[PDB]
UniProtKB/Swiss-Prot annotation:
Nuclear corepressor for KRAB domain-containing zinc finger proteins (KRAB-ZFPs). Mediates gene silencing by recruiting CHD3, a subunit of the nucleosome remodeling and deacetylation (NuRD) complex, and SETDB1 (which specifically methylates histone H3 at 'Lys-9' (H3K9me)) to the promoter regions of KRAB target genes. Enhances transcriptional repression by coordinating the increase in H3K9me, the decrease in histone H3 'Lys-9 and 'Lys-14' acetylation (H3K9ac and H3K14ac, respectively) and the disposition of HP1 proteins to silence gene expression. (Microbial infection) Plays a critical role in the shutdown of lytic gene expression during the early stage of herpes virus 8 primary infection. This inhibition is mediated through interaction with herpes virus 8 protein LANA1. The chain holds residues 619 to 679 of 835 of the full protein. This is Transcription intermediary factor 1-beta. It is found in: Nucleus. It comes from Homo sapiens. Belongs to the TRIM/RBCC family. The HP1 box is both necessary and sufficient for HP1 binding. The PHD-type zinc finger enhances CEBPB transcriptional activity. The PHD-type zinc finger, the HP1 box and the bromo domain, function together to assemble the machinery required for repression of KRAB domain-containing proteins. Acts as an intramolecular SUMO E3 ligase for autosumoylation of bromodomain. Changing K76R: Modestly reduces sumoylation and repression.
Length: 88
């Protein structure tokens, strides 16, 4: 790419694309999709630290940090082939 037309600058590395998670895949479904969109790593929501409500400015890193999605799974089945315990 280069060789000696810049003589390096502040640091020496540039850092390649980092994240390999957001910036693609799922969509916000509330304001934007193909660009800037932090997802909820606790369930399956898709928003940004600025399209929640007048109160989403806590940026921990990467995306937001999920919110109050409240997705209590009442019909989820995980290898329920044999009823060992006793809960229909
Ligand atoms: Zn959004
Ligand atoms: Zn969530």
């Amino acid at each position: 790419m280069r060789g000696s037309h810049h003589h390096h600058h502040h640091g020496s590395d540039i850092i390649d694309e980092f994240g390999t998670l957001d910036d693609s895949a799922t969509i916000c479904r509330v304001c934007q999709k193909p660009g800037d969109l932090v997802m909820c790593n606790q369930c399956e929501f898709c928003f940004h630290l600025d399209c929640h409500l007048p109160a989403l400015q806590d940026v921990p890193g990467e995306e937001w940090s999920c919110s109050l999605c409240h997705v209590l799974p009442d019909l989820k089945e995980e290898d329920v082939d044999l009823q060992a315990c006793k809960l229909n």
